[PDB]
Amino acid sequence: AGIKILLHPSGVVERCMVSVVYNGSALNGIWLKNVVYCPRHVIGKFRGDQWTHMVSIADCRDFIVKCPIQGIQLNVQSVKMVGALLQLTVHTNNTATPDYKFERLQPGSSMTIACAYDGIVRHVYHVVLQLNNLIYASFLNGACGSVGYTLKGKTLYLHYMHHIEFNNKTHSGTDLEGNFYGPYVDEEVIQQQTAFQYYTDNVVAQLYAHLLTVDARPKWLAQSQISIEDFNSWAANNSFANFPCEQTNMSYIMGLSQTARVPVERILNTIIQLTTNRDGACIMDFECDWTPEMVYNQAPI
Amino acid sequence: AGIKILLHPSGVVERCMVSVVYNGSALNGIWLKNVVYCPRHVIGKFRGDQWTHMVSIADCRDFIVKCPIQGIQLNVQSVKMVGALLQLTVHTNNTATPDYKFERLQPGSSMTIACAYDGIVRHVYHVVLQLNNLIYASFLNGACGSVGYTLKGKTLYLHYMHHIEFNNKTHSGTDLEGNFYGPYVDEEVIQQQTAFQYYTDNVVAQLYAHLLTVDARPKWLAQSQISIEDFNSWAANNSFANFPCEQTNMSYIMGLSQTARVPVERILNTIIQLTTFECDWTPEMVYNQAPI
Ligand SMILES: *[C@@](O)(CO)[C@H](C[C@@H]1CCNC1=O)NC(=O)[C@H](CC(C)C)NC(=O)c1cc2c(OC)cccc2[nH]1
Ligand SMILES: *[C@@](O)(CO)[C@H](C[C@@H]1CCNC1=O)NC(=O)[C@H](CC(C)C)NC(=O)c1cc2c(OC)cccc2[nH]1
């Protein structure tokens, strides 16, 4: 019935976005219950263990907190730094607060970005947390505080809040608890990123999506097979993660192998052979944007 | 930062979605002011011109309409057919109605899809109206009533309402005026799909996206150049639309060529050499995320 990069509706996140201004720094934040969560560097660009002293002397009323979607100006009563985030307790309780959970995202999974500016989500796109704990997104100045999220069943799952943009078009941040993804920090210094490794489960997923939609026999789908052990011994020297990266993803890769009648050993052997050739499918594989769940949930069984 | 497929936030669309049920037919609908819009086949699977009689005898009271996001059940006072859409005038006015407009989409133009079910938007994805007036979308049963939209400055532009899933994984429907995109109708029967043709503007923007994302000199890039006139001849026999398909896109295409320092004649020449769904890029969306 069609296989697309699906995203989660942003209406629930939209009504909770607020703009936060302190001194000359401005960014975004989410207003849950009577608390506003925003990047802690909205009060200044510090480093190390000097954050605890600035939050202790943080002028509560110096925070300009506006919810543009509800037209309310909020008043910060107390400031509590939790990790790399600020929990600003306001007097007003957000009526638009949904059922929510603070859930950490595993590398290789997908989430939806509510890219906001001045407290208003302007764009919405889909990223995948990579093995180097980074995402390849689109963020300009004033996008700090934009949240990555997913929806399950009338409950909103918050996983991300934007902080830093690395020059290789990669981005990093914390969860809604204040813990950075990877060893990166919210400091303007030299930060080395871990070696990029392919999330094999998503490379296999992106291959099955072509086999479901290309309809024509791909000239890159090899006629041989390679086993999981032979692949994992090869993956250690070819920048590929251990397959399977997630046992739950196998249940989807297994349904994809039966609905396409192409065994997973055919895809792994192709991945080994397709290292020499294609990545983008431009005219005449190898990507982590398709997840095994998103492909299987859209495939006819 | 990077170049991504940008979609529009569905918050305004969500608060207006409602569920429309008539007999054993359940689908979605959008609620603007005191009028509800929904596909007419909710009252039955008809064909041709009997719609006028079937709607004139369809009671404004067998319609079950609810807005789940607002938890409000709505009653229909009057029913009117406008094209392939139904106009159900309800008693309550939607307080969550933004400044909206019924703008028709042109071939090659991108739009954000709000895949809804029982009045609740479940998934959001991005499509481009193809030259055969088709969209490669993702809809299951009950997704009828879903809308395709864009946003420009606090104003919502509604372009599409899903009706039909074809054999090939392509979908079709009408605008918000009730007129189908292409020569298709809301009938369960094999329909002739117009011959496919590549939107050269969006294909050109596809190649320009890689030059800004990756290196300045990929392998597939051709070192020679072909003219717009010479390409247009080859396009008439190779299923490529006449370039430029939209003169407005040349503002972005020329800005992308100077930004990437590779002319549009090389891109067109590469497309000829490259000959011997997915993430479709429009020239505006690529140029907007490009620096300077
Ligand atoms: C926020 O909007 C600030 O409120 C901003 C978002 C980035 C700006 C441009 N595109 C974005 O995504 N965040 C920052 O500017 C942060 C500030 C930190 C948390 C103190 N810094 C970066 O994103 C950043 C800094 C540097 C750098 O320096 C030195 C060198 C290389 C990369 C880099 N990224
Ligand atoms: C709506 O939800 C109905 O309210 C439904 C959406 C499709 C269902 C599966 N995936 C979808 O996108 N629409 C239909 O089922 C329509 C109903 C029409 C407008 C009366 N029917 C089709 O889209 C359809 C029917 C047939 C067919 O018959 C016979 C033969 C071949 C293709 C085909 N498409």
Numbering used by the authors:
A (entry chain A): 1 to 284, 288 to 304
B (entry chain B): 1 to 276, 289 to 304
What do the authors say?
While the spike protein shows extreme diversity and quick adaptation to thwart antibody responses and vaccine effectiveness, the 3C-like main protease (Mpro) has remained relatively conserved. SARS-CoV-2 Mpro also shares the same overall fold and active site with 3C and 3C-like proteases from various coronavirus species and even other viral families. In this work, we report the crystal structures of Mpro from the gamma-CoV SW1 in both apo and inhibitor-bound form, as well as the crystal structure of the delta-CoV HKU15 Mpro in complex with PF-00835231.
Viral species from the delta genus of coronaviruses have mostly been isolated from birds, but they can also infect mammals, as exemplified by the porcine HKU15. We also determined the inhibitor-bound structure of Mpro to 2.45 Å resolution from the porcine delta-CoV HKU15, and the same inhibitor (PF-00835231) bound to Mpro of SARS-CoV-2 for direct comparison. Another repurposed compound that progressed into clinical trials as lufotrelvir is the hydroxymethylketone-based covalent inhibitor PF-00835231. PF-00835231 bound at the active site of HKU15 Mpro, with the same binding mode observed with SARS-CoV-2. Due to the variation of amino acids at the active sites of the two variants, the degree of packing with the inhibitor varied despite the same binding mode. Overall, the binding mode, as well as the interactions, were largely conserved between the two protomers and the two Mpro variants. Closer analysis of the determined cocrystal structures revealed that the E186/188 in the 180s loop establishes a salt bridge interaction with the side chain of K45 in inhibitor-bound structures of both SW1 and HKU15 Mpro.
